[PDB]
Each structure stands twice: as structure tokens, then as C-alpha cells.
């Protein structure tokens, strides 16, 4: 088990980073902090403390756990938290993501 950011290990620590999170963003800090994410200070850019995965451009209805599974399926935190079945389900829902983001 190897973490990327030991300082952002706890929920309380990640919550602290959302102090200056833009009020206009339609995703709530607690939902993002719970999915292992913390605010990186630029735009609406969040990173996972474990896999170092970065996400941005948060739209309304976006589920942080689904997005975590969608883009960073091998994250060991996402797996002990949500399980292989969930990760495999989301992966099945979006089976050509590389070719989705590659134009």
C-alpha cells in the first residue's frame, strides 16, 4: 500500500483544503473529501491523496466516487472503500474512455 500525499491521509485534513473552494462549484467539499480528494488551489482542481489522480470541471450531478472509478480504477483507496464490483461496474459503463478523451 503506497500513498502519494501522507499529509492529506485524513478527512479532516482534506476538508481544511476546501476553505477557499469556489462557492459557485456544484459539487460539495464533503463529497469530494470523502472520495479521498483535496483542493489544489487552482481552478476547481482536486487531487486524490492516494493515487495522485487529478479531476476538474465539476458539473452538476457529478458523483466523486463514480468519477474516481471512471478515471483512476486502479486506486487502492477507491478499491478498499468501494470494492472491485463497483469499480468493474463503472468501467463497464464507460468502456472506451481513452478513445472518449482522445477526440
Ligand X SMILES: CC[C@H](NC)C(=O)N[C@@H]1C(=O)N2[C@@H](CC[C@@H]1CCNCc1ccccc1)CC[C@H]2C(=O)NC(c1ccccc1)c1ccccc1
51 is in an annotated binding site: yes
Check if the beta carbon of residue 9 is closer than 8 Å to that of residue 49.
yes
User: What is the torsional sign of CA 82, 76, 63, 16?
Assistant: positive
Residue 51 sits in the site that holds Zn ion (CB under 5 A): yes
50 is in an annotated binding site: no
- The count of other CB atoms within 10 Å of the CB of residue 51 is 21
Cβ-closest residue to ligand X? Answer: 54
Residue 50 site contact among ligand X, Zn ion, none (CB < 5 to 8 Å, cut-off depends on kind): Zn ion
57 is in an annotated binding site: no
Shortest Cβ 65–ligand X spacing (Å): 11
C-alpha cell at 102: 482522445
- Alpha carbons 18 and 40: distance in angstroms, whole number: 9
Q: Across the strands, what pairs with 54?
A: 47
- Which range in 10-18, 56-64, 68-76, 88-96 contacts Zn ion by CB under 5 A? 68-76
Annotated binding site for Zn(2+): 48, 51, 68, 75
Which chain residues interact with Zn ion by CB under 5 A? 48, 50-51, 53, 72, 75
Amino acid at each position: 500500500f503506497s500513498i502519494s500525499n501522507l499529509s492529506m491521509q485524513t478527512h479532516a485534513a482534506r476538508m481544511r483544503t476546501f476553505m477557499y473552494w469556489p462557492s459557485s462549484v456544484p459539487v460539495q467539499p464533503e463529497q469530494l473529501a470523502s472520495a479521498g480528494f483535496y483542493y489544489v488551489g487552482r481552478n476547481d482542481d482536486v487531487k486524490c491523496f492516494c493515487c495522485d489522480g487529478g479531476l476538474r470541471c465539476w458539473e452538476s450531478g457529478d458523483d466523486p466516487w463514480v468519477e474516481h472509478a471512471k478515471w483512476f480504477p486502479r486506486c487502492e483507496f477507491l478499491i478498499r472503500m468501494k470494492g472491485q464490483e463497483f469499480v468493474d461496474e463503472i468501467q463497464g459503463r464507460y468502456p472506451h474512455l481513452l478513445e472518449q478523451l482522445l477526440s
